[PDB]
Amino acid sequence: LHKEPATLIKAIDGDTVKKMYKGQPMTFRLLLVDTPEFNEKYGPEASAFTKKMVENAKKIEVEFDKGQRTDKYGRGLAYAYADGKMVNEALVRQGLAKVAYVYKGNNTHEQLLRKAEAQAKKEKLNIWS
Ligand SMILES: Cc1cn([C@H]2C[C@H](OP(=O)(O)O)[C@@H](COP(=O)(O)O)O2)c(=O)[nH]c1=O
Numbered sequence: 001l002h003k004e005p006a007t008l009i010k011a012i013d014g015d016t017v018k019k020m021y022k023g024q025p026m027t028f029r030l031l032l033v034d035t036p037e038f039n040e041k042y043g044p045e046a047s048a049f050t051k052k053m054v055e056n057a058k059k060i061e062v063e064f065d066k067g068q069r070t071d072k073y074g075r076g077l078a079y080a081y082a083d084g085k086m087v088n089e090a091l092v093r094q095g096l097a098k099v100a101y102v103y104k105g106n107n108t109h110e111q112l113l114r115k116a117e118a119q120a121k122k123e124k125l126n127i128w129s
């Protein structure tokens, strides 16, 4: 896989971020994770975590996996990076997202994210508290 440029347009919630990619607006849904909805417990905390991470970044990048690049809603499916740190992993490591939606052929970073979730669980963080 490889990282590609994008710019932030708007953080939407814990696991959706609108970005400009190849010069076009696109809503990205973060691969391999599930944050709570805003109306659910830890939903506002997940939204805030993602928002701060992408708004503070000097450099946003997206990385597509090997398989489908958009979902049935037209959302881009990618790993998002903020100054080189993966947002998807950081959410899971903080107990603000579960590893989820692991479809075959778009699962390159699965084991990395599962390791983060185990550590969040051991620490009883947030969702795991
Ligand atoms: C993360 C992800 C979600 N989706 C779909 C599955 C779910 O369909 P349904 O909408 O029918 O439940 C939905 C979950 O996204 P949200 O967690 O954003 O709701 O998005 C994909 O198809 N591929 C993916 O990689």
Ligand SMILES: [Ca+2]
Residues within 6 Å of the ligand: 015, 034, 035, 036, 037
């Ligand atoms: Ca969600």
